[PDB]
Amino acid sequence: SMKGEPKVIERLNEALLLELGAVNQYWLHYRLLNDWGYTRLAKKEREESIEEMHHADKLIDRIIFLEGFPNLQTVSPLRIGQNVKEVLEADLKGEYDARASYKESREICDKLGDYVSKQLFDELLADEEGHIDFLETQLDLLAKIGGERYGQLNAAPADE
């Protein structure tokens, strides 16, 4: 009787595909930022990757509970920056994509009466707008102090 709405499972798998992409994008940005010297921003990027990992684990559990089958076989297309600002903007564009898919999804769950899944999307939505606030603030800072000083701020001295 716990069999879920197939449209709801579709939306959760759609969210999962986006999360898996975000996990990989953030992790590669972490390693790239590190190789370039921006170790403080690299660290924040690692943490963001791990937060998306947790979101992906929540979606899988909800999908399997609804007796759907979670798709981990494919990953959404990654946006890979080649300097700091591009990395921040690549991440921002991904969060806005996620925001819109979750906005759509909570409405679909609502209309079909799966209120617990609705609640799951509403929580992912507020998390994303969290990540979005952070990134927009960093990009505004980068813009007002300039890329090279933003880079220096987010870099460690050589003895660390």
**Contact set with Fe ion (CB under 5 A):** 52, 55, 128, 131
Do 29 and 45 form a contact (C-beta atoms < 8 A)?
A: yes
Give the separation between CA 50 and CA 33, rounded to whole angstroms: 16
Contact range with ligand HEM by CB under 6 A, out of 36-44, 47-55, 96-104, 142-150: 47-55
H/E element, 157: none
Q: Is 51 annotated as a binding residue?
A: yes
Instruction: List the interface residues with a second copy, window 76-135 (CB under 8 A).
Output: 77-78, 83, 96, 103, 106, 113, 115-116, 119, 122, 125-126, 129, 132-134
Using the structure block, give the residue that is written with the tokens 């906005």.
103
Structure-token pair, residue 92: 């921002």
Give the separation between CA 110 and CA 158, rounded to whole angstroms: 53
Q: Which of 73, 79, 25 is nearest to 49 (CA)?
A: 25
Return residues touching a second copy (CB under 8 A): 1-2, 20, 24-25, 27-28, 31-32, 34-38, 40-41, 43-44, 47, 57, 60-61, 64-65, 70, 72-75, 77-78, 83, 96, 103, 106, 113, 115-116, 119, 122, 125-126, 129, 132-134, 136-138, 140-141, 144-146, 148-155, 157-160
